[PDB]
Amino acid sequence: MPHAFKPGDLVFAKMKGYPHWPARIDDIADGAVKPPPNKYPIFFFGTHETAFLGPKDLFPYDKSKDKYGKPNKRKGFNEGLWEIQNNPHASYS
Numbered sequence: 001m002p003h004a005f006k007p008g009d010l011v012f013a014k015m016k017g018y019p020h021w022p023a024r025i026d027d028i029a030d031g032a033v034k035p036p037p038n039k040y041p042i043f044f045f046g047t048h049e050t051a052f053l054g055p056k057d058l059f060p061y062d063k064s065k066d067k068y069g070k071p072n073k074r075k076g077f078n079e080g081l082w083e084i085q086n087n088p089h090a091s092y093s
């Protein structure tokens with residue numbers, strides 16, 4: 001059975017006005033700004049943006065990839081698909 005989300009988990013994350021986007025639950029670096037209560041730091045592959053989301057917008061990658069893991073015209077999306085499949089735990093600093 002599922003656990004809670006933890007850093008390193010791979011997801012498609014949903015933001016208003018955007019397709020479900022390949023992303024990961026990030027760690028918070030020492031000294032870094034912490035998310036709000038009940039939110040996780042989401043790192044979006046491809047665009048390398050960060051946003052803070054709750055579980056309602058987080059779809060586990062393995063379950064969801066057949067639905068959401070297809071090319072998109074949006075900027076950074078296909079680069080994002082490559083990263084989540086090929087090196088999802090790399091430094092993209």
Ligand SMILES: CC1(C)CCCN1CCN
Binds near residue numbers: 015018021044047049
């Ligand atoms: C990838 C994502 C949907 C995350 C938040 C902003 N961004 C789109 C705008 N560049």
